[PDB]
Each structure stands twice: as C-alpha cells, then as structure tokens.
Amino acid sequence: SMSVKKPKRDDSKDLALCSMILTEMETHEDAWPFLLPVNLKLVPGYKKVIKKPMDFSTIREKLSSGQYPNLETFALDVRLVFDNCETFNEDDSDIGRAGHNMRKYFEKKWTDTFK
C-alpha cells in the first residue's frame, strides 16, 4: 500500500530473456503455422471468428518497439497464439498438433527461465 512495498524483483533482464525465448519458438520446426499473420483475405471464417489474431512476427515487432509493459503481457500474447489455434483447428490435424507441441515447449521455457 502507500509507502509499503514488497522487495524489488530484478526485471532488468526480462526484455532480453523474452527475446531469447521468442527466438527459440521462431526456430522450432513446428513453428510454421505461427510465423506470420493468418491471411484474412484467403482463409474463410478467420476474420469473424478470431477476434484477436496473433502470430510470432507480430509479437517480435511489439517486443522490439516497447509495446510490452511487462513480461506477463508478453506471455499473454504467446498464449493467445495457441488459444486461437485451438479455436480454429481440430486437435487431430497437423496445425492442431503443432499448436499443442509449441504451447508445451513455451510453458517449459517460461517456468525454467522465470519461476
């Protein structure tokens, strides 16, 4: 509360460490459904159904330009990418399985780097 603060967690490396995680996600062999924004002209149904599209290139640009206020807003966009994928793709599809694999990969890196 006013003039009463918990001890200061060092966040000075968070930007660099989120960048490194994002690099590892970008280079995973199952990243291909997620590298670029879904083409809303060529994929029927996407625009209406997926209210907040997100992809790794968009996260990379947001990260590089100071549009994440803290590491939690960064994790929320990564998770959005996989939540969108599960909303639109059957579990038993190449893209559906890709999304589950990447979400697992992310969550481990996130826990190991920050928890």
Side-chain angles (χ1 to χ4, degrees), residues 1-7 9-12 14-114:
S1 71
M2 199 183 330
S3 310
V4 184
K5 287 310 164 330
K6 296 200 183 53
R9 188 203 165 250
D10 184 14
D11 66 345
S12 60
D14 288 0
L15 185 61
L17 287 157
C18 289
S19 184
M20 285 170 62
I21 295 168
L22 180 57
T23 297
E24 296 165 357
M25 275 195 312
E26 291 166 334
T27 59
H28 192 293
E29 72 163 293
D30 301 339
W32 58 266
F34 316 110
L35 295 177
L36 298 177
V38 176
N39 184 335
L40 300 180
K41 304 170 196 292
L42 303 181
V43 177
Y46 209 82
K47 188 174 206 295
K48 185 64 179 273
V49 170
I50 300 294
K51 303 300 179 186
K52 291 176 68 166
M54 188 53 58
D55 68 285
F56 295 166
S57 77
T58 300
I59 296 172
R60 171 70 71 195
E61 184 63 36
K62 287 180 68 170
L63 193 61
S64 292
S65 63
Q67 292 185 66
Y68 293 115
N70 57 57
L71 83 168
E72 302 304 333
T73 59
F74 168 81
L76 280 173
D77 266 358
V78 179
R79 292 167 181 144
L80 175 64
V81 168
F82 308 126
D83 294 348
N84 290 345
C85 181
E86 277 196 54
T87 292
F88 210 80
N89 294 265
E90 273 296 342
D91 295 344
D92 188 7
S93 64
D94 294 277
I95 292 171
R97 282 185 283 281
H100 287 293
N101 289 349
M102 295 299 306
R103 181 195 300 272
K104 186 91 180 171
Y105 189 72
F106 170 66
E107 289 306 344
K108 168 107 155 74
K109 304 279 182 186
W110 189 250
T111 293
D112 293 358
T113 300
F114 293 117

